[PDB]
Design a protein around this ligand. Structure first.
Ligand SMILES: CC(C)N1CCC(c2cc(-c3ccc(F)cc3Cl)c3c(c2)N(c2c(Cl)cccc2Cl)C(=O)NC3)CC1
Ligand code: NA
Length: 335
């Protein structure tokens, strides 16, 4: 195990090489969860989660994406966002720098786990969804869009503390905004509010709101609740080419969400109604949603901070693979 004070083992067909401080590595699952282990960090003296990045410098865009992930994790430090406790590489020089390891808080569960193992009370949904929006307010205010928010990217520990995992870095399409589905090139932060809506719907009902079996079925299920858009709304939520997928559907009125969410807190229904809207910019913002009466138990404007804009200047400039690597290497070494 080349580097001093580091040891090697095989976990899910692949070699993990970690410092002696990291003990009892246990894979979370097989496949898409094959890059993450639970561990005990003997230096920090606590249980941790460790993520081995797949192939960080395989191409230009992967090198670029690796850098960005590191950057966002530092810039977006917040109570409801996952933050780095450690970062390392088995490399001793930039010449053998090919792997990056990220060490965070061990949360232990995601929102899927929460929905599966337990029926959720309305008061419990208020708390969970409050935190997710509070994390998202911060993310958005830095000028970052998640773009793929769903239950498996939202971590919750046994004290019901919630942290957002990842920022759309790189799957189910049940939580993706229609404008993303329809390849609208000019989407913004509001796409995540659609996802929050679907997530909140699922916490309340214990089941997915729009579980499409395929692309066309996904759009169908969606329109069958929210109604088909006017041409004017359709013009601002899709690529020209993707319009046919909505135009050739039968015209449908919006359903009454009181009939979909029968028995729910009328406040939840109201709010869901301001999130699950085709006209994207009519969607309530994360900051605005926090002020909604539904979260009136937990809302604290003084304690729902905004971020400084995320600085894009380094990534605005074109660099070689070998340069993104050197930038990432220094970023790792500086932790
Ligand atoms: C399939 C895709 C969508 N993805 C789902 C999320 C997974 C995932 C990633 C990360 C993560 C994120 C950023 C980072 F820098 C380092 C790490 Cl380790 C964590 C977790 C899970 N969990 C976790 C949960 Cl939430 C449930 C069970 C077991 C565990 Cl370990 C934590 O507790 N801590 C961090 C990775 C794969
Ligand atoms: Na606080």
């Amino acid at each position: 195990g080349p580097r001093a004070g580091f040891y090697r083992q095989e976990l899910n067909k692949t070699v993990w090489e970690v410092p002696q401080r990291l003990q009892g590595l246990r894979p979370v699952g097989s496949g898409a969860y094959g890059s993450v282990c639970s561990a005990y960090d003997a230096r920090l003296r606590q249980k941790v989660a460790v993520k081995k990045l797949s192939r960080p410098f395989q191409s230009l865009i992967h090198a670029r994406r690796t850098y960005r992930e590191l950057r966002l994790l530092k810039h977006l430090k917040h109570e409801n966002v996952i933050g780095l406790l450690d970062v390392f590489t088995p490399a001793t020089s930039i010449e053998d720098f090919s792997e990056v390891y990220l060490v965070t808080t061990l949360m232990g569960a995601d929102l899927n786990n929460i929905v599966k193992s337990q029926a959720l009370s309305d008061e419990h949904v208020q708390f969970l969804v409050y935190q997710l929006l509070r994390g998202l307010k911060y993310i958005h205010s830095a000028g970052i869009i998640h773009r793929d928010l769903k239950p498996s990217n939202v971590a919750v520990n046994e004290d019901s503390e919630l942290r957002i995992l990842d920022f759309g870095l790189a799957a189910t399409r049940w939580y993706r905004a229609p404008e993303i589905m329809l390849n609208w090139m000019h989407y913004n932060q509001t796409v995540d509010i659609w996802s929050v809506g679907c997530i909140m719907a699922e916490l309340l009902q214990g089941k997915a709101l729009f579980p499409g079996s395929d692309y066309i079925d996904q759009l169908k299920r969606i329109m069958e609740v929210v109604g088909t858009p006017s041409p004017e709304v359709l013009a601002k939520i899709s690529s020209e080419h993707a319009r046919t997928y909505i135009q050739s559907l039968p015209p449908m009125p919006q359903k009454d969400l009181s009939s979909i969410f029968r028995g729910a807190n009328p406040l939840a229904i109201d709010l869901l109604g301001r999130m699950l809207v085709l006209d994207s910019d009519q969607r309530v913002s994360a900051a605005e949603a926090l002020a909604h009466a539904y979260f009136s138990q937990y809302h604290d404007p003084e304690d729902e901070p905004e971020a400084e804009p995320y600085d894009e200047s380094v990534e605005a400039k074109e660099r070689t693979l070998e340069e993104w690597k050197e930038l990432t290497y220094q970023e790792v070494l500086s932790f």
